[PDB]
Every structure is written in structure tokens, then in C-alpha cells.
Amino acid sequence: MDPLCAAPCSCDGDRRVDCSGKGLTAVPEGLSAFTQALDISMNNITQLPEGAFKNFPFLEELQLAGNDLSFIHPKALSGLKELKVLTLQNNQLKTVPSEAIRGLSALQSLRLDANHITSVPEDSFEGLVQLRHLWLDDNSLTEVPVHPLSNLPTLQALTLALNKISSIPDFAFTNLSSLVVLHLHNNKIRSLSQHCFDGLDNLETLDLNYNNLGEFPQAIKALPSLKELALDTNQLKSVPDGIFDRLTSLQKIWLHTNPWDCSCPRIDYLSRWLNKNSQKEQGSAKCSGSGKPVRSIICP
């Protein structure tokens, strides 16, 4: 009993349409203009033509994950002024579709994870004045997209995890004043510039684990709201003295699976801090060689 539907989708009376997993190559014809949510994930849509969603002016949620989408017409998404959620994960995108999403002024959540994105055009994310959540994980980015990210002061959640980023320059995230969580784990970051995190005044969670950090990130000093800091599974040998003095918001820190050099007086400050702040360390930082916990070390 779907008065406003078309084969082989379902229309669940709350103006949500489900056409997922149906072997579709296109948006089905004859769907209602009342539609508020459209799930067309897990099909075989490789291309979206112009005006593909022209008859859905009140669409709030569009699920396109798991297709094999490799081409989005610059005007495929025209007229979707109400759209809040766009999921494009697990497709064949090579480029962030900058122009096609430009008019999505109500968008709050954008999933671009698990594509094959190697580049993000400079003008990406202009027009996304309400965006809150952005997933860019599991792509092929080799750098942080600085100018495109500068367009998103409303952004709260960002993942750039599982990409190929090797360094982050000064002021890379400077306009992201609302950002609460930032994931940068599973990249190949060896170089963090001294001021790469400036302007992240609301940041609570920072994940930098599974990288190639050889030097401790001084840049973390610019994070007054920092609650959770993951630095596990890097190549860290020492921390600079007094690095945590101004991180009075810290609640959890991961330091394990790093080759800590437990020579005195180099390990002095870190050993004492870990002993005074035992409640904050998650797991155990160990001395390279012996495997003795860093907190158990004392310098005379």
C-alpha cells in the first residue's frame, strides 16, 4: 500500500523511500514529490545526469553509498535546497565534486569516505554554510585541503584518517573555530609544523595515532579545549619539558607503542607527569629495550 511509490522501491508512509540493493542504474521514475528521504545505496549507479533529483524539492536525506559512482553532472543536485544529509561513501570518485554540491546550503553531513579521491579543487565546500560533519577518510589525499576547509566555520567533526598525508603546514585549520573532533590517524605524518593547529579553540578530541611522528607535536599547545589526545603508535622518543603545563582540560592521553628513551634527565618530566597524572594515561607508555612502564622511572 504505497500510493506514492514505484517498483521496486518501498515508501514507508513517513515520506521515506527505500530503493537500496535493487540493481538500479538510475534514479527510478515515478517517485513522489512529497519524498523527504531517498535511499538508493548499494545499486549500480555509475553516473548522475543533470536534474536527476529535479522532482524532489523537499528532499532532506539522500543515500548514494555503495554504488560505483564516478561522474556527477555539475547540475545533478540542482534544486536540493532542503538537503541535510548526503552520503557518497564507497563509490569511485577521484575528485571532490565541488560544483555539484555548491548549491547545497542546508547540508549538515557529507560522507566522501572510501572513494579514491586524490584531489580537492580549491573552491570545494564554498556554499556549505551549515556543514557540521565531513568524512574524508580512506581516500588518497596527500595533503590537508587548506583553502577548501577555510570555508567551513560551522564544522564540528572532520576525519582525514587513512589517507596519505605526510605533513601539515602552519594555519592549516585556522578557520575551523567550531571543530570539536579531528581525526588524522593512519596517515604517514612525519612533520607537524609549529602552528598547524592554531585557531582550533573548540577542539576536544585529536587523534594522531598510527603515523610516523619522530618529534613531539609542539602545535598541541594551541589547543585550550583539548580533552582527548592520541599519540600512540608513532616514533616518539621524548617530550619537551613542560609541554602539558597549559593543557588543564586534558582527561585522556594515549602514549603507548612509542620507543620512549628512558635516559635521565631526559625522561624526568614525562615520568613525573605520568605519575602525577596516572588517571589520564590510557594503557602504558613503555621504555624501549626493557619494556618498563615510563611512570615507574625516577630520576635523582
Binding site: 545505496s41 580512506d138 573532533v181 593512519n186
Partner: protein, 79 residues
């Protein structure tokens, strides 16, 4: 059940029996998020109480009806 999924999908672990059963999924059920990994993608429970969809374990994107979302957390009234 299934032990390794197709390279993109997520394993959900169940103990409906007294055995551990896996099932492969394109997304994850409500209360769970898609944790992407180099080795194995899995569904993991959100750590936020009364969260229906989440970005990560400590950041909710959709609270239970009647609750208020603020900075990834669910509140019984607007903060």
C-alpha cells in the same frame, strides 16, 4: 558466520548464541558506527548514551527522539 568481508564492508559481531557469530554489512545498525581500519572494517557501539547514529565513539550525529544534540552529545534539555 563470515570471518572477513568484501574490501569495503563492515563486520558486525554477535553473541545471540553462546558462540561468537560475525555478519557482513554495507553500513552498521543504529547505535553503531562504521570504524574503518587498514586490516578489518567493523561495526562498533557508540559510547554516547542514547545515541542513534554517530560520527565516532564519542561524537553523536543523531540523538534519541526527545533529546537534544549539542557538540556531539545528547542532553535531556537544550544546553
Amino acid at each position: 558466520g563470515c570471518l572477513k568481508c568484501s574490501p569495503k564492508l563492515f563486520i558486525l559481531l554477535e553473541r545471540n548464541d553462546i558462540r561468537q557469530v560475525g555478519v557482513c554489512l554495507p553500513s552498521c545498525p543504529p547505535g553503531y558506527f562504521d570504524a574503518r581500519n587498514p586490516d578489518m572494517n567493523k561495526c562498533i557501539k557508540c559510547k554516547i548514551e542514547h545515541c542513534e547514529a554517530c560520527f565516532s565513539h564519542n561524537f553523536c550525529t543523531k540523538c534519541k527522539e526527545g533529546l537534544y544534540l549539542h557538540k556531539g552529545r545528547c542532553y535531556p534539555a537544550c544546553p
